[PDB]
Amino acid sequence: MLEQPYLDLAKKVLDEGHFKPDITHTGTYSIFGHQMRFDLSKGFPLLTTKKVPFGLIKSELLWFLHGDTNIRFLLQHRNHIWDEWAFEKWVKSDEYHGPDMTDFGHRSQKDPEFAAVYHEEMAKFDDRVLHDDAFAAKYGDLGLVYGSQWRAWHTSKGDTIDQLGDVIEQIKTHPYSRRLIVSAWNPEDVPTMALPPCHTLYQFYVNDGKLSLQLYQRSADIFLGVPFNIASYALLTHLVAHECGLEVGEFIHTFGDAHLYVNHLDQIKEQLSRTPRPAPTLQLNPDKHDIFDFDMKDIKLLNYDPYPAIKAPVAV
Amino acid sequence: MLEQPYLDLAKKVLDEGHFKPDITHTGTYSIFGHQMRFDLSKGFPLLTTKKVPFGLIKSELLWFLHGDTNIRFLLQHRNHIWDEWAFEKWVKSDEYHGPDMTDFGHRSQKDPEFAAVYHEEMAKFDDRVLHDDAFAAKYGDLGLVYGSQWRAWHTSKGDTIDQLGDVIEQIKTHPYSRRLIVSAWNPEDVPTMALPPCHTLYQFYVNDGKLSLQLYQRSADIFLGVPFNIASYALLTHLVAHECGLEVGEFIHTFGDAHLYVNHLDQIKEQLSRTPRPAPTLQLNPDKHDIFDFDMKDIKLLNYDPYPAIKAPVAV
Numbered sequence: 001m002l003e004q005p006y007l008d009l010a011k012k013v014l015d016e017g018h019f020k021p022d023i024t025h026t027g028t029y030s031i032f033g034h035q036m037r038f039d040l041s042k043g044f045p046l047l048t049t050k051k052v053p054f055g056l057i058k059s060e061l062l063w064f065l066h067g068d069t070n071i072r073f074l075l076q077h078r079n080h081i082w083d084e085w086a087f088e089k090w091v092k093s094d095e096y097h098g099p100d101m102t103d104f105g106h107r108s109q110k111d112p113e114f115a116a117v118y119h120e121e122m123a124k125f126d127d128r129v130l131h132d133d134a135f136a137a138k139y140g141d142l143g144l145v146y147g148s149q150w151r152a153w154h155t156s157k158g159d160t161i162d163q164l165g166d167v168i169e170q171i172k173t174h175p176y177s178r179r180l181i182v183s184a185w186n187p188e189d190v191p192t193m194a195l196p197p198c199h200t201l202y203q204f205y206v207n208d209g210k211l212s213l214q215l216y217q218r219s220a221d222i223f224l225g226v227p228f229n230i231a232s233y234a235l236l237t238h239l240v241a242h243e244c245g246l247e248v249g250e251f252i253h254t255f256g257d258a259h260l261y262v263n264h265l266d267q268i269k270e271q272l273s274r275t276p277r278p279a280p281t282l283q284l285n286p287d288k289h290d291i292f293d294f295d296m297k298d299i300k301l302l303n304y305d306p307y308p309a310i311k312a313p314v315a316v
Numbered sequence: 317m318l319e320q321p322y323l324d325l326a327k328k329v330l331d332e333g334h335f336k337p338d339i340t341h342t343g344t345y346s347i348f349g350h351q352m353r354f355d356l357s358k359g360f361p362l363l364t365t366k367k368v369p370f371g372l373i374k375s376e377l378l379w380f381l382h383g384d385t386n387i388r389f390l391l392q393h394r395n396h397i398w399d400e401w402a403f404e405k406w407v408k409s410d411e412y413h414g415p416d417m418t419d420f421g422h423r424s425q426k427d428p429e430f431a432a433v434y435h436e437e438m439a440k441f442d443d444r445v446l447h448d449d450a451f452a453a454k455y456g457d458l459g460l461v462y463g464s465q466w467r468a469w470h471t472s473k474g475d476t477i478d479q480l481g482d483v484i485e486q487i488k489t490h491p492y493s494r495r496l497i498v499s500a501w502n503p504e505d506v507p508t509m510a511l512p513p514c515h516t517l518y519q520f521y522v523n524d525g526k527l528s529l530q531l532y533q534r535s536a537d538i539f540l541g542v543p544f545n546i547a548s549y550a551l552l553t554h555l556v557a558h559e560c561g562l563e564v565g566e567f568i569h570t571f572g573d574a575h576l577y578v579n580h581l582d583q584i585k586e587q588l589s590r591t592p593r594p595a596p597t598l599q600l601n602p603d604k605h606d607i608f609d610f611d612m613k614d615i616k617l618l619n620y621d622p623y624p625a626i627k628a629p630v631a632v
């Protein structure tokens with residue numbers, strides 16, 4: 001089946017993944033160097049052995065394509081994947097004058113009392129960003145995240161470079177280029193960042209009128225992250241191919257350090273006992289071609305019939 | 317055998333490599349996305365089915381580690397791998413007042429007369445760089461090449477960053493880091509470069525006291541380039557592991573666009589009929605540990621018994 005490479009990766013990590021401790025104090029089982037490809041003409045690689053929220057994937061990817069770096073857009077689409085990173089800024093800023101939120105991550109996980117007060121200052125924060133423009137501009141802006149790295153790379157001369165927009169033109173005028181690359185890794189910023197980009201760099205390739213894309217992911221969470229990671233890039237490949245009038249090819253996903261956090265074992269095993277169902281189909285808007293102007297309704301998934309969602313804890 | 321992954325790659329390109337035209341007007345057979353690993357505790361992956369000049373590999377790698385960007389160092393070790401790039405600068409500069417060298421590449425290949433006058437201005441040039449300091453500093457300095465990207469990345473604040481030196485310290489103080497990355501790809505420079513780095517980015521990884529390294533190569537010449545490419549990185553892995561007092565693990569080589577130029581077919585087939593011999597052994601200087609101060613005699617290859625060298629044309 002289409003998603004088999006994912007299940008195979010999981011099994012492999014359980015079979016030969018050596019224990020490797022990580023900063024979160026949790027502990028993982030990892031491997032270094034792995035590659036899996038997906039033939040996109042066979043369907044969309046959105047996992048059927050577990051329910052994955054495509055809406056969250058669409059809204060975040062579009063957020064990226066717009067070159068946006070402000071959470072507000074996401075909150076407007078009920079997407080809370082990036083909230084924590086912004087909330088941190090708020091909590092640490094001197095303008096914050098409320099309950100102490102020191103390491104609200106594991107604390108809210110190990111404390112029932114805190115896991116409500118924390119969930120209050122957060123909802124409070126999300127309200128200010130959505131309504132208070134001055135607040136949104138100050139605390140709702142992440143700064144260095146995919147949207148600005150892809151479309152607004154800052155140069156030494158003080159300008160900005162639209163990597164993605166440029167690369168798309170190169171594909172149109174020089175499809176056989178072996179330099180169709182986009183990097184999110186900047187040696188200058190990396191040491192001062194809280195989370196240096198996981199999806200380090202990707203390359204496009206064209207042959208026989210078909211667009212393929214390879215992604216180099218330096219670190220990956222087999223259970224929680226990868227299911228999303230695959231759909232984001234399999235989707236970007238379609239969008240870029242839509243814009244360039246090409247056919248879709250393969251999505252090659254390359255891993256540096258792929259891992260399973262020890263607290264997800266039973267969950268991954270449970271999923272592995274499920275039998276993949278036929279994959280869904282993607283449907284992009286034919287009358288609209290500028291993918292940078294795309295919006296939710298311009299992308300639709302058909303025939304996604306997944307197994308029930310599987311719950312698992314986070315790693316902290 | 318140790319080098320089998322290389323032979324397997326070659327066969328695969330001959331079997332399923334679709335024709336894909338390239339800028340050099342030559343024409344290639346390519347594939348997108350491939351990965352091969354080499355267990356470095358089994359020997360040094362220097363091809364035995366064809367003679368490869370290790371000396372050229374040592375001298376170029378050391379040139380890189382020193383953060384050097386001037387050809388002089390190479391010429392002093394009889395290494396002419398980078399000459400053309402510098403020679404171009406000379407020929408195009410107004411200070412050049414001699415025979416016309418327009419596209420001296422294919423011209424020297426399609427003309428017997430020219431393939432001597434060109435080989436004269438070149439030897440002349442190599443003499444000036446080696447003896448004329450002012451000339452060396454002006455024309456012998458490549459500027460943006462691996463040595464400066466690895467150890468002197470220019471920031472917007474006008475400073476310089478030693479990526480490699482920093483990463484080596486991170487390994488020593490945080491071996492389990494999933495951020496042990498070095499990038500040679502800078503979105504600001506790429507569009508103005510004659511040859512954007514082929515070896516785009518690499519990552520280190522540690523487990524059980526063993527250092528592994530994965531390389532992402534965006535473009536590769538299966539016949540002429542890869543045999544070198546493999547030894548350079550299998551060697552850097554040893555040097556970095558020497559410096560950090562770790563054991564050696566695997567060298568994972570990841571390809572974006574791997575290709576065979578149509579004029580190397582008979583040569584690759586011929587090599588494929590040869591049977592790999594036992595791989596050589598590397599030997600680094602035990603009393604010397606600062607790899608940045610390493611020199612030729614500090615690295616030695618033992619038991620390399622290759623088949624005769626195979627001749628093939630260049631692509632232009």
Ligand SMILES: O=c1ccn([C@H]2C[C@H](O)[C@@H](COP(=O)(O)O)O2)c(=O)[nH]1
Pocket residue numbers: 195196198219220221222225226229493494495
């Ligand atoms: O899109 C994402 C974002 C994060 N992670 C995971 C990778 C690691 O589990 C953790 C980041 O830890 P570091 O690799 O930065 O050290 O988050 C993913 O798999 N995919």
Ligand SMILES: O=c1ccn([C@H]2C[C@H](O)[C@@H](COP(=O)(O)O)O2)c(=O)[nH]1
Pocket residue numbers: 177178179511512514535536537538541542545
């Ligand atoms: O170390 C190197 C340097 C160059 N090449 C090859 C790759 C391509 O054949 C050509 C560069 O063409 P572009 O990919 O830049 O377009 O040189 C290698 O394989 N290895």
Ligand SMILES: [K+]
Pocket residue numbers: 183184185186187499500501502503
């Ligand atoms: K980069």
